[PDB]
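Budget justification note: compute hours in this period were largely spent on complex prediction jobs such as the one shown. Inputs:
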Amino acid sequence: SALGKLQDVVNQNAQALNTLVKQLSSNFGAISSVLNDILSRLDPPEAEV
Amino acid sequence: DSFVIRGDEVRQIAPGQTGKIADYNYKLPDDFTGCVIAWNSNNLDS
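Corresponding output:
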């Protein structure tokens, strides 16, 4: 732990990328988080919404 | 676009609809459309 200054930078970069990837499963109020399923079972009007 | 149709089937003359007419007789694009008009014709058709 004599190189904390460098390790923090690596960790923060990794944390930012990990959170960004995780965000893809968020619903954001949608019916479902997966585009393929909303489209596969919904009419174009509501599917588009 | 002029045509005669069954009374109950009028509900299918719209965007975002499914059914017999929507699929095999008359489909509307998902876009603006001027106006939909209709009137009864018992005095002249039946």
